Write a protein that binds this ligand. Structure first.
Ligand SMILES: CCC[Si@](C)(c1ccc(OC[C@@H](O)CCC(=O)O)c(C)c1)c1ccc(OCC(O)(CC)CC)c(C)c1
Lengths: 11, 240
């Protein structure tokens, strides 16, 4: 449900 | 006809592709080794290849004009749904019709239909995927058209879970009109004949490929021994 790696690469 | 804003969009996207696609393929040395010598012997290497490519797709997407005006939720929805399709599009650069393979600079990193099958996939995916690679290669796209098509693919308003569909559509429309105008002004005939319609057909083809890849990925990743060989990024983006 959380996308922390994608969120992080998205800045 | 091609407005200065449209020329600016093209310039940004060409630069974004140059910053996120490395045609020397130097980083492939970092991936777990391909094994070819049945077990899924190519799964570790191809999981690392796919995971690396996802990172490059996110880096490209962040540079698309307007993408950063979307909410984080919508940026996430759009990358989760499009990454598989952008990987198929961008891999066309290394695909060669000489032997229908993806040639990334050396024999170790030259991939054929057998390598895809050794990551667990079947002809249900692989046959349409080769037909797509051949059809796209035959369009002989200008680099300008290739980067616009990748951007249009990412910014699609009909992806599942999109919240602000009207804003996604407004951003895509600016890219679509840039591409349509580029073809009419800069792509000489006969190569330009029905080119925009043929490029949009490739986006429909990608939806079909996405649906099949997702079905097989779900079956593969459901087996814990296979999921163990994936990467954390692949599990987050493609699903867990
Ligand atoms: C056999 C290869 C054929 Si593929 C089209 C490929 C070819 C060249 C590539 O890279 C070219 C260059 O583009 C890289 C440089 C850059 O992008 O910057 C890339 C990324 C992919 C392939 C294979 C396996 C697979 O999934 C397996 C899986 O479902 C197993 C569970 C998920 C792990 C996927 C999604 C796609």
């Amino acid at each position: 449900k959380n996308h922390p790696m994608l969120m992080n690469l998205l800045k | 006809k091609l407005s200065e804003e449209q020329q600016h969009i093209i310039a940004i996207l060409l630069d974004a592709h140059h910053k996120t696609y490395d045609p020397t393929y130097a980083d492939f040395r970092d991936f777990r080794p391909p094994v070819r010598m049945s077990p899924l012997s190519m799964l570790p290497h191809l999981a690392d290849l796919v995971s690396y490519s996802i990172q490059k797709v996110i880096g490209f997407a962040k540079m698309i004009p307007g993408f950063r005006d979307l909410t984080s939720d919508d940026q996430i929805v759009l990358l989760k749904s499009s990454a598989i399709e952008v990987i198929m599009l961008r891999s066309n650069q290394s695909f060669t019709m000489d032997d229908m393979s993806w040639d990334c600079g050396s024999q170790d990193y030259k991939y054929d239909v057998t390598d895809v099958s050794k990551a667990g996939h079947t002809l249900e995916l692989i046959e349409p995927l080769i037909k797509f690679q051949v059809g796209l290669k035959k369009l002989n796209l200008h680099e300008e058209e290739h980067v616009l098509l990748m951007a249009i693919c990412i910014v699609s308003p009909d992806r599942p879970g999109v919240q602000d569909a009207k804003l996604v559509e407004a951003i895509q429309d600016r890219l679509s009109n840039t591409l349509q105008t580029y073809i009419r002004c800069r792509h000489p005939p006969p190569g330009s004949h029905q080119l925009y319609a043929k490029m949009i057909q490739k986006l429909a083809d990608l939806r079909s490929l996405n649906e099949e890849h997702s079905k097989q990925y779900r079956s593969l990743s459901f087996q814990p021994e296979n999921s163990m060989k994936l990467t954390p990024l692949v599990l987050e983006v493609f699903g867990n």
